[model samples]
Target: KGGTVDGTRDRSDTHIQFQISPEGNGEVLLKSTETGQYLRINPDGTVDGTRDRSDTHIQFQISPEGNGEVLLKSTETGQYLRINPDGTVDGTRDRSDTHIQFQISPEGNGEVLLKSTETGQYLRINP
Candidate 1:
């Protein structure tokens, strides 16, 4: 009988996982599960991220690990947000001059906006 396993772990890897055959030519034997993502192992053992898709469909090596930089795009205005450590977005876009600061809550999903002496425009990363 087939069974299933699911839980949170520090690490997990499986063999004989999943595959797709070529043009119905032959049985595509499972070598590994590739649909999921992990860090990239360099020849010298240095690891970079292999999967990340956030901030306007832009993905990169850096991740959302405390104070990490984020590259976000505004699909609505075709603008970009270069988030800095000080919570400031470095660009003269809609809210750049407004003094943006990242205020994260316990859940971590926060807002991006500018609040200056003269301007206050808040942009939500999520609805």
Candidate 2:
């Protein structure tokens, strides 16, 4: 005999999940586990947490830089996820930009942290 506790296995609303693109390339969609959001860039090159799961703008090409670090390229705008000089996160059209890199560190149960390779700060939600 079993207990009455039964819960769904939908732990999708807890951490970021990488949806591999079907392009046969290294591109992928970084989706928010809590909501229906994809890490997307705005027309103004703001690297904001927004998008449709099917939009190409939200398709971020990923590549490992080094030491568990990586870079995200906004495919639609040909821009890299960058940290602005004002400590704001945005995109850089410069292909030679090194500030677009980030270091990923796994935390908690399945969540990970994204820290700017340029700025010694962590990516966070606004207050």
Candidate 3:
């Protein structure tokens, strides 16, 4: 059920994103560094990469725990970036859940991976 470089994700995915300072106390816009798509959360609770940028308020506030774990909170929707039961990612309004916590790890070459503290899996954007 798992392979490092599978068909769904590989060495050629253009999903590398960026945020300005990498600081915990800043409001940032996350986007694909290559495709320039903004990561936005819809009212229906689905995350999308909007290419043209809408009024969806793609800004997210960094919520870092004491141990340096991060919890991304949508500035517009007030929901946390949560890892669902099936390992699919979603934004939910449950502020008190542990599934919202993520561990950030460097993958080298100016890349990083958002790891789910609960699921013990890295966040992957499906094509």
Q: Highest TM-score among the candidates is held by which one?
A: 3
Return the TM-score for candidate 3, rounded to 2 decimals.
0.72
Task: Give lDDT: candidate 3, residue 116.
Answer: 68
List model 1 lDDT by residue over 5-84, tens digit each: 11111122221122211212321111113333221222332222223422222211211323532322223233333333
Q: What digit string (tens of lDDT, one per residue) describes model 3 on residues 16-126?
A: 333323324567766555455556666777776665455555778877786879887888889887776575667899878988897776667575666667776555543
Q: lDDT tens digits, residues 52-111, model 2?
A: 455667777877887878887877887887765556667787867867777766645575
Listed per candidate, the RMSD to the true structure in angstroms reads 18.1, 10.4, 5.5
TM-score for each predicted model, relative to the true structure:
0.18, 0.67, 0.72
Which ranges of candidate 1 are over 4 A from the true structure? 1-96, 108-127
Candidate maximizing lDDT: 3
| lDDT score for residue 110 of model 2 | 70
Better of 1 and 2 by lDDT: 2
Clashing pairs in 3: none
Better of 2 and 3 by lDDT: 3
Worst 10 residues of 3 by lDDT: 1-10
lDDT, candidates in the order shown: 0.24, 0.58, 0.62
Is 1 or 3 the stronger prediction by lDDT?
3
